[PDB]
Structures are given as structure tokens and as C-alpha cells.
Design a protein around this ligand. Structure first.
Ligand SMILES: COc1cccc2[nH]ccc12
Ligand SMILES: COc1cccc2[nH]ccc12
Length: 1104
């Protein structure tokens, strides 16, 4: 009945866990990072983190642990998903082919059980005898480790202690032994059990239970020679081991709860600890010797090292380097120094990694140009709180601009053999060449002895033996550097025109119609080595040297007229190594051999905007795994450039693009420029690390931004942003924020709300103090901060005009929060006017509850207050006055409107459709969803389709059912397990303003950004069929079924997804092998071809 398409615009960025070990090989040190559904694998080096392989799971990663059974040469990886998919994984590399293989898998869900409270815990014994899982209170699930247990069959042990806080397997025990903290009415306790595989039961543990701190929260199992356990609490750190017990209560940890630990030394001599304010501690275990040669713990000490991002996890990586994995802020690499600095920190940040999460609110604004949407998010929490401004495509920063029409090519040149930077830019035109010299930022015409100015240049550059080369339509000219003289000139035997040229430092290949000539550059000599006659006219050439080649190519890449071939030829023989026919009647225009992330590719652009690319074996010349993207509608010219120590390809067309690599796949990102015809890198004194760009009229020089799909600007607030709205008439944002103060109350640090240009107050981890920030849309400076009342929490924000009043106001809805109130019984609506650098209060209305949500509605103000939805009019006396009320809610948390229709999202009874009835001045309840759902966000897709997100990470779509009692039942016609928690939906697009209609973005807790759009039945059916066929050919990590992953799942209900296409799966079509493609298309509704589908999937990827 309803047809929706959901796709990832930004993958989750928050770090949910991190481990180290030897996964990729015995000798490698790896960091593995879990970002919800993604697993990232790195090799740790001296340079830092080298990415080797990233994969998606069809599940939320809940457990991730490396372990090494006997009879394994390197670590295996245990993953458990939130839907109880268990797997054992092995890394396997053969060639440039990397696979994660599933060694064992099965689902370990029980029929009876509600999830525990400190969540899923999975632990592995040091001796690899078993995996232990705490999934439900009162049960401990054991998976015997045994290479024959490939289905990961398990048994449950009754656990007497119902409320386990944390649990680990101990080192140095004769039988597998767990150590855990649990809570009963008599307080918190630490206890141990042995786990008997024979008996499938617990046995008495090696040491008796002890009482621990009331807030003991984490168990650390200390390796030999210490053995035993460390128990971290809020006020205390204790060690336990047999008839051995040691406790410290260091005041330095008491300010903030410690929430993560990491072992620095293999023998447990030192641990890192991180708290909720980003403090980083070293915990140091002092050894005591014994006559029998055992080692016992003499003492524990804690030292403050400094401050990091608020850490979800810490991993020491050797050589003083720590990876700080953050959920609430940016992740980091930090370095620990033996000696402190001028402020006393031992911690020095080396590198910062972008985390958008949590995205708690966002909005779309055409900040810079019309039709070019940017997303502005409220991101992070506490000291990590920020605005993030997200926009598609790569920017150029223009530093020079010269009027100079009709450029046909650009080449940079080093005219001085003693200087490393370019000093010369050579320009081609129809029938002509011009040379520009660069003196600082000055750019002047000039002649260059040796070069001719009265032929068109096809190539010029530095070549071997301190020489320059110019290849024109007439000849190849070889020029000495000092002085500039012609030292050798090559012409075709009858002086026919050169039609195509390619050149590296020591080799030249020129075409003359169908003929090819191969020259070598020697001292004062162009040496003709070989020639051939191609079957057809030559369209394009390349001899870019790849690999450990010494600047020499054994290969010549060629594109031909007529058969539209790309071929790899051997030099010097010109023997055909490999031929690919590209199809059509439109010739190749640009061909390039290139290397990305150490793999070799052949790129070939046609004049219609198509780019084909292939893997290239530089040994055999074999092309493989053809793929095709469309880069425009005009001839593309390809050119290599370096930025930030990486080689990329710039593609000039009507739509300039950078081609680059990410996770060993080619990626394409728009450059934010009008049409570019030609470019070259340029690295001169006055224009370091730059690009020269030409169109029909202009020559530009500038620098390029980071090569990435999305550009992110960060605005640190140093406090928690909560909501955002844009006020066009003021050219600013309003942002609700809260900061923590300690009980007067005292701030922990300066932040946006205490550092505004001007400030105002309302007149009447200890306390939240709430503020409305006014933020400039261009500088993101905090222009003004208005502070609310003590214990007043700001929940809702809108910028709008009301009634016949021409002013635009910021309107804020609040709650008065008191400790023993089940919910708030009091709050305000406050109308503010931003004028002359400050907020003035124009009006207030006290209400008897929390103002959760507000929306402008037809010149009126719609607000949700506890269990009520209310519409206010703005009177001539500038007051809000109730028009009508709706009462039939539990807790009305979310509103959206369209026309006279109102979608209401409830705490627990899903969604409800109201209509305002303009001839009766009241609401009519049209229909509601009688299926209970715990809502997190709502959106109206159109008059008949309503989108919900709920707390168990599902989407659904409701429609009207086409009695009166029947018409009042909304039908859930779409269901989809997204696997993210949606905080906000908002209509809009990051793509400059079709198989899809409409555009709704959403932001999530993990910093994932997604898009929802609508499909026709026809499109839905085709794509559903594609999914089903894709799911047969794709091998999933852990052998999870896609249909299982995407099934709607709450504690009440599991059902197959319906009415939803998984765009991430569809887009993965462009990454499968061609045998697989063919397989996917066999008999698919005329009979579709691979290439039809490749086209269809491209149209789809363009919507984000
Ligand atoms: C369930 O345990 C296994 C599965 C797969 C491979 C393994 N190697 C040693 C134990 C093991
Ligand atoms: C090491 O790489 C990361 C870790 C955490 C977040 C990240 N964002 C971009 C890269 C990245």
C-alpha cells in the first residue's frame, strides 16, 4: 500500500567499542573499531592507523572480542549482534583479495527472557575453553569453544544473583572461573564461580564473596603474574585474589564516574581509566616479591594524566599512543609523554576524528547559495557539545583569477633544475601555446627558449637528464635546462601531424592517426625505439608508470575509434596484452593507469560522460571487474594530482569530480564548481600545493579541501545543545542548550551560554542550567544567551510569525523539573524577540505541564503539554490564547503538521492523526495507530502517509484504511528494522535542487544520517526483486540473513519488513562481480540487462 526507500547518507560515526590484537596476521598489531553496524580494521604502525578492511554486518554489534584457540595461527573474532546473531570470524588475504570468513555461527536467543539492565555482556576465557554471555537476568549462557561446534550450540546455567553489574573470566585458574559484581538489598558484592563443562553448572569459586562499594560498576581481570580482579567504583578501587584484598579510596576519582579501562602493560602493571568528564588516569599496580616466586600486589596508585574526549573506550597502541573512542564527541589519537607540559598534562592530542553523534536535533538551511541545502545538527553532549554544518561536495579556495579564454590544456613545469617547486605554467590553445612564469603570486607571460608558441601543445614537462619536453601537433621537442636550448627534435618520417601524446620522465608514446611511436628520452637524444599500426585510429594514450617501477612503464594503455576499445599493450613490442570493448559509437576521450591505496586501476572516459574502470594487473596487463559510473554528459578529461600525501584523479567535465579510494573501492565526489575544462596540480612558491583550473573564459588557481563526500564544519559549544531552529529574518540560529553546574551553583568550565556577547536571564553533575543561544549564521559566534529559571528545562523551540503580527519570534517551551514528580506539573511558553543584539521577552504563558513540542500552524501556535495538544492564537495584545484542546494522549512528545492535519507521537501509543476543523474551531481525531509503540520521532510524508521511529530501532509507516470505527484505525503498511535510534526527521536534501519522490533526512544517536523517499509500486516491485536476488549471491559476514536483520523487531512483535527498500543493499549492487550481476538479472522483469540495473542504481545514489 505504501512504498519507501531508506538509504545511508552518513554512516554511524560514534565508537561503540574497540579492541586490539593480532587478527590480520600473527605479526600485525590491529585496532578493530565497532561503529554500530560497521567494523573497521586497522594495522597499527609508526605512521599511525593504516585502514585495511571495513565491512558491514547485518546487525548491531553488541559484543566484539579477539581470541586465539589452540590450533589457530592468529586471532579469531567473536561478534554478537543485538538480535543475538553469534559468529566466529577469521581474516583471510589472498592477493589484493581480502575476505572475512565465517568459521562458526548461530542465533543464541532464548524464548523466555527480557534483556538485562547493564545490557548484553560477552566474555571469553583466557584459555579459550568457552564463551560466556549474560543476555538475561538469572541466566548465564555458555558456548563451548571447540572447532566442531560450528553452530555455536550453547547451554544455560541458572545464576542465583539476578542483578549482575559486570562479569569477567579470571586468569590463572585451573577451571574457567567468572568474577562478578552483583546487587541485592544488602548492597553490592563481588563473587566467583567455576564453570564446569562436564556438569553444565557452576561450581564454588576459588575465593569467597566480599562486600564492595555501593557503586562498584566494573570488573577487571588482571593477567598473570598478579591474577585476581580489580573492582572500580565511584569512590574506591579494590583488588581481590583469594586470601588477598587491597582497597584504595583516592579523592582524585570522586568528581566523575570512571566508565572505561584498558590494560597498558601485558602483565597488568598499568591500566588507563577514563571518566565522564574526559579525565584520563593511570592505575599502577605495584608488585611484591615472594620466596616461592609468585608475585602479589603491594599497593595501587592512581595518577591524573590529562584530558581526552569523553571516552566510551580506550586502547593503548604501544609507543605512548592511545586511541580514544568516543560516543559523545570526536574520537582521537593521543600521545602520552613521560614528562608533563607547562600546564601539567602528560597527554598530547595527535589526531581528531569526526563524530556527529548523538544528533539530538537538526535543520536544513540554504546557508550560502539558493537550492544548496546544508544540514546543521545539534551534536554531542557535555564538554563535547557542538553544532555541525554538513554539506555535499568538495570546495575550492580560489587564490587567483585571470581572464584568458580558449585554454585547451595546462602543464606545470620546473624551469630551474635546482628548485623543487614549479615556477612555470604552460597553456595550450587552438593552434598555439603560451608560457606563464610565476614570481610569487605574480603571473606573467614570457617565452621559453626551446618551446614553440605557434603549435598546439599536447604535453610538456620535466623529463630525465635535467631536460624539458614539449610535444606539439608538429614534433617532439627536447630541451636542455641550462641553458634552455633545443637538443633533439623528433618528427614522423613524412612529418605528418602528431594526434595524441603521452609522456613520463623517460618514455614517450605519440600517435599519428593509426600509427604509434615509442621514444625514450636520453641525454640530448630522443631515441625512436619501436612503432606499430593500430587496427583503428587512436583516440587516447597513457603510459603513467605504476608501482615499484622506477618511473618506467612496461605498459601502454590505449583507446581506439570504431571498436571503442581500451587495450593494454606491452612496450616496446606493442603486443596486445588485453582488449576491452566498451560498447556504443562514442569514442574514448581519456585513459589513465593509476594507483589508489596500493591497487592498480585502468580508468577510461567516453565522450558521453561515462567512466569505465578496471583492476589492472601491471604484470600481465589483465583488466578485471569492470565497473561504470556517469560523471556528467560531456567528455571527461582525467588528470592525477596529490593532496595531503595522497594521489587522486581530477575529472573535468560539465560536472567536475574527484576520483579517489576508500576501503579499497573507488569513490566519486562532486567538486563544488561550475564546469571545468582542464586542470593541473601546481606547487609554486606563491601557490603551494594548489590546482590550476580552466574553463572557456578563465584561468583559476586555488587549493582544494579534504577529499571526502561530505564537508563538516564544527562549532564547539562546550555544553549540551538540545534543539535548533533557523530565523532567516535575523540571519541567525536559535539553539537550546544546557550546561551542568555543581551545587549558588558553580560551572565546571566556560561554555557557549557563559561566553555570549550579551546575556539575559529570566526573573522569578548536580544541576542543569538551560539557555537559548542566538548564533550568527555566518561566523557561528554566540551573539546572545538567555538563561531560564532555576530548575526550568527548555524542551521545545520554534521560529515563526503569528496572527497579524509581522515580527518573527523565537518561542520556547519549558518544564519545571522537581525530584519527586513522576512528570512535570508546570512549565512555560515564552515568546522572545531578537532585536538590537538581545532577546526581549514579549510574552509568557504558564501551563500545567511540560511543553514537549511546538509547531507553527496556519499562523497559530500548536503545542503539546503532557497528555494534551493545544492550539493557541496570537492576540492583538501580543498574548497567546487557547483556541482548542485535544486530551486523548498518554504523553504527547512529538508534533508535525501539514495543511490542517496534525501528526501526534505518543510516549507509548504510537501515532495519531488530528485535523483542525476551521469552520468549528476545534480538533477532530481522524484516526490513530492502535498498535502500541514507544515513539522517538515522527514525520508526515504526505497527506496519507505517516512515518514513525521507535525506541527499538524500527521504522514504520501508517496510512488511513480505505464503518466510522474502521476509518479511525491507522494501518501499519510499512515496517523496517533500521538498527539506529532516530531523534529527528526533517524534510530536505543536501543535493542541489525520478525513481523517487520527496526527501526526509534523519539524524541518530550514533551520528548516522539517513534519507527516506517514496517509490512507485512499479519501482518498489523491481527493487524488492533485486534485493531478493542480491541476498542469494552476497555472502554476509557471520552468515546473517538480510531478511532477518531487517525484520521489524520489538519485545511485542517480530515480522518481516514490508513496504521498505534497503537502499544500502540496492547500492551494493554496484560492487558485486559481473558473474553475480548477470546472476542477479536473469529473467528479471522486457528482460533487464546488467547495464540497465547499473543505470537504475546510479539514478538512486544521486538522491543523497
Ligand atoms: C566454537 O569454537 C570454535 C569455532 C570455530 C573455530 C574454532 N577454533 C577453536 C574453537 C573454535
Ligand atoms: C580512526 O578513524 C575513526 C575513528 C572514529 C571516528 C572516525 N571518523 C572518521 C574517521 C574515524
Amino acid at each position: 500500500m505504501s512504498y519507501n526507500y531508506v538509504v545511508t547518507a552518513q554512516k554511524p560515526t560514534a565508537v561503540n567499542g574497540c579492541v586490539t590484537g593480532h587478527f590480520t596476521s600473527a605479526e600485525d598489531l590491529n585496532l578493530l573499531i565497532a561503529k554500530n553496524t560497521r567494523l573497521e580494521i586497522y594495522v597499527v604502525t609508526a605512521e599511525g592507523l593504516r585502514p585495511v578492511k571495513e565491512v558491514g554486518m547485518y546487525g548491531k554489534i553488541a559484543v566484539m572480542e579477539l581470541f586465539r584457540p589452540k590450533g589457530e595461527s592468529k586471532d579469531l573474532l567473536f561478534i554478537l549482534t543485538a538480535k543475538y546473531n553469534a559468529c566466529i570470524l577469521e581474516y583471510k588475504q589472498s592477493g589484493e583479495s581480502i575476505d572475512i570468513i565465517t568459521r562458526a555461527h548461530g542465533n543464541v536467543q532464548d524464548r523466555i527472557g527480557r534483556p538485562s539492565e547493564t545490557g548484553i555482556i560477552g566474555i571469553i576465557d583466557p584459555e579459550c575453553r568457552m564463551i560466556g554471555l549474560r543476555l538475561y537476568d538469572g541466566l548465564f549462557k555458555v558456548i563451548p569453544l571447540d572447532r566442531d561446534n560450528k553452530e555455536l550450540k550453547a547451554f544455560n546455567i541458572r545464576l542465583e544473583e539476578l542483578h549482575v553489574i559486570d562479569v569477567k573470566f579470571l586468569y590463572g585458574c585451573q577451571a574457567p572461573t567468572i568474577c562478578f559484581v552483583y546487587q541485592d538489598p544488602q548492597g553490592r558484592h563481588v563473587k566467583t564461580y567455576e564453570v564446569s563443562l562436564r556438569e553444565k553448572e557452576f561450581n564454588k569459586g576459588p575465593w569467597k564473596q566480599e562486600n564492595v562499594e555501593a557503586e562498584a560498576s566494573m570488573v577487571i581481570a588482571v593477567p598473570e603474574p598478579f591474577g585476581g580482579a580489580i573492582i572500580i567504583g565511584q569512590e574506591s578501587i579494590t583488588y581481590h585474589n583469594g586470601d588477598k584484598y587491597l582497597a584504595i579510596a583516592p579523592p582524585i576519582i570522586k568528581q566523575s564516574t570512571i566508565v572505561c579501562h584498558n590494560r597498558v602493560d601485558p602483565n597488568g602493571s598499568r591500566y588507563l581509566l577514563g571518566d565522564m568528564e574526559g579525565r584520563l588516569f593511570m592505575l599502577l599496580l605495584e608488585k611484591e616479591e615472594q620466596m616461592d616466586g609468585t608475585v602479589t600486589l603491594k599497593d595501587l596508585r592512581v595518577e591524573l594524566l590529562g584530558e581526552t574526549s569523553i571516552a566510551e573506550c580506550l586502547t593503548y597502541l604501544d609507543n605512548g599512543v592511545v586511541f580514544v573512542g568516543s560516543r559523545l564527541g570526536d574520537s582521537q589519537l593521543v600521545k602520552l609523554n613521560v614528562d608533563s607540559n607547562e600546564q601539567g598534562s602528560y597527554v598530547v592530542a595527535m589526531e581528531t576524528f569526526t563524530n556527529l553523534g548523538p544528533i539530538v536535533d537538526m535543520c536544513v538551511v540554504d546557508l550560502e547559495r539558493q537550492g544548496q541545502g546544508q544540514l546543521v545538527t545539534c551534536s554531542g553532549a557535555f564538554k563535547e557539545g557542538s553544532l555541525r554544518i554538513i554539506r555535499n561536495g568538495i570546495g575550492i579556495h580560489e587564490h587567483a583569477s585571470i581572464d584568458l579564454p580558449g585554454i585547451k590544456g595546462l602543464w606545470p613545469l620546473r624551469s630551474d633544475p635546482n628548485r623543487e617547486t614549479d615556477d612555470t605554467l604552460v597553456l595550450s590553445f587552438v593552434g598555439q601555446t603560451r608560457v606563464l612564469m610565476l614570481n610569487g603570486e605574480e603571473v606573467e607571460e614570457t617565452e621559453l627558449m626551446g618551446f614553440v608558441d605557434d603549435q598546439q601543445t599536447f604535453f610538456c614537462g620535466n623529463v630525465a637528464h635535467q631536460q624539458l619536453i614539449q610535444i606539439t601537433s608538429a614534433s617532439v621537442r627536447l630541451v636542455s635546462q641550462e641553458p634552455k636550448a633545443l637538443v633533439s627534435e623528433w618528427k614522423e618520417p613524412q612529418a605528418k601531424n602528431i594526434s595524441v601524446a603521452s609522456c613520463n620522465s623517460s618514455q614517450v608514446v605519440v600517435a599519428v592517426g593509426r600509427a604509434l611511436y615509442y621514444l625514450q628520452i636520453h641525454p640530448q637524444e630522443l631515441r625512436q625505439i619501436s612503432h606499430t599500426e593500430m587496427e583503428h585510429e587512436v583516440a587516447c594514450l597513457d603510459i603513467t608508470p605504476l608501482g615499484d617501477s622506477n618511473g618506467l612503464s612496461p605498459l601502454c594503455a590505449i583507446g581506439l575509434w570504431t571498436d571503442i576499445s581500451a587495450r593494454i599493450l606491452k612496450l616496446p613490442s606493442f603486443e596486445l596484452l588485453h582488449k576491452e570493448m566498451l560498447g556504443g559509437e562514442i569514442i574514448p576521450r581519456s585513459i589513465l593507469m593509476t594507483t589508489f591505496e596500493s591497487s592498480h586501476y585502468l580508468l577510461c572516459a567516453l565522450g558521453d560522460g561515462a567512466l569505465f574502470y578496471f583492476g589492472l594487473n601491471i604484470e600481465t596487463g589483465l583488466l578485471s571487474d569492470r565497473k561504470k559510473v556517469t560523471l556528467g554528459t560531456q567528455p571527461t578529461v582525467l588528470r592525477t594530482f596529490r593532496s595531503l600525501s595522497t594521489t587522486n584523479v581530477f575529472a573535468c567535465s560539465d560536472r567536475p569530480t574527484v576520483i579517489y579510494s576508500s576501503n579499497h573501492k573507488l569513490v566519486f565526489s562532486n567538486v563544488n564548481l561550475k564546469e571545468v575544462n582542464y586542470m593541473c596540480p601546481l606547487n609554486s612558491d606563491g601557490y603551494p600545493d594548489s590546482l590550476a583550473l580552466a574553463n572557456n573564459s578563465t584561468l583559476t588557481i586555488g587549493t582544494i579541501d579534504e577529499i571526502q563526500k561530505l564537508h563538516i564544519r564544527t562549532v564547539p559549544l562546550y555544553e549540551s545543545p538540545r534543539k535548533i531552529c533557523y530565523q532567516e529574518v535575523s540571519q541567525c540560529f536559535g539553539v537550546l542548550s544546557s550546561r551542568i553546574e555543581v551545587q549558588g551553583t558553580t560551572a565546571l568550565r566556560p561554555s557557549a551560554s557563559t561566553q555570549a556577547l550579551s546575556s539575559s536571564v529570566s526573573s522569578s553533575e548536580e544541576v542543569e542550567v538551560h539557555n537559548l543561544l542566538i548564533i550568527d549564521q555566518h561566523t557561528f559566534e554566540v551573539l546572545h544567551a538567555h538563561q531560564f529559571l532555576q530548575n526550568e528545562y527548555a524542551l521545545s523551540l520554534v521560529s515563526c510569525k503569528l496572527g497579524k503580527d509581522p515580527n518573527t519570534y523565537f518561542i520556547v517551551g519549558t518544564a519545571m523539573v522537581y525530584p519527586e514528580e513522576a512528570e512535570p506539573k508546570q512549565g512555560r511558553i515564552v515568546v522572545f524577540q531578537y532585536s538590537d543584539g538581545k532577546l526581549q521577552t514579549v510574552a509568557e504563558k504558564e501551563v500545567k505541564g511540560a511543553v514537549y513540542s511546538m509547531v507553527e500552524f496556519n499562523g497559530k501556535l500548536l503545542a503539546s503539554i503532557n497528555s494534551t495538544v493545544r492550539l493557541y492564537e496570537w492576540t492583538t495584545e501580543k498574548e497567546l490564547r487557547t483556541e482548542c484542546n485535544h486530551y486523548n494522549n498518554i504523553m504527547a512528545l512529538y508534533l508535525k503538521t501539514k495543511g490542517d492535519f496534525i501528526l501526534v507521537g505518543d510516549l507509548m501509543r504510537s501515532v495519531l492523526l488530528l485535523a483542525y476543523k476551521p469552520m468549528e474551531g476545534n480538533f477532530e481525531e481522524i484516526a490513530r495507530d492502535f498498535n502500541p509503540n514507544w515513539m522517538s520521532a515522527v514525520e508526515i510524508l504526505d497527506d496519507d502517509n505517516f512515518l514513525g521511529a521507535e525506541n527499538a530501532f524500527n521504522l514504520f509507516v501508517c496510512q488511513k484504511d480505505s464503518t466510522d470505527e474502521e476509518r479511525q484505525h491507522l494501518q501499519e503498511v510499512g515496517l523496517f528494522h533500521l538498527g539506529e535510534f532516530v531523534n529527528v526527521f526533517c524534510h530536505g536534501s543536501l543535493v542541489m535542487q525520478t525513481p523517487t519522490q520527496g526527501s526526509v533526512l534523519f539524524g541518530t544517536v550514533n551520528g548516522m544520517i539517513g534519507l527516506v523517499t517514496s517509490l512507485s509500486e512499479s519501482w518498489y516491485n523491481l527493487l524488492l526483486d533485486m534485493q531478493n536476488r542480491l541476498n542469494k549471491v552476497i555472502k554476509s559476514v557471520g552468515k546473517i540473513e538480510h531478511s532477518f536483520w531487517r525484520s521489524f523487531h520489538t519485545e511485542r512483535k517480530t515480522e518481516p519488513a514490508t513496504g521498505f527498500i534497503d537502499g544500502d543493499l540496492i547500492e551494493s549492487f554496484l560492487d558485486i562481480s559481473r558473474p553475480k550481476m548477470q546472476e542477479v538479472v536473469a529473467n528479471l522483469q522486457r528482460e533487464a540487462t546488467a547495464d540497465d540495473l547499473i543505470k537504475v542504481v546510479e539514478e538512486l545514489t544521486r538522491i543523497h
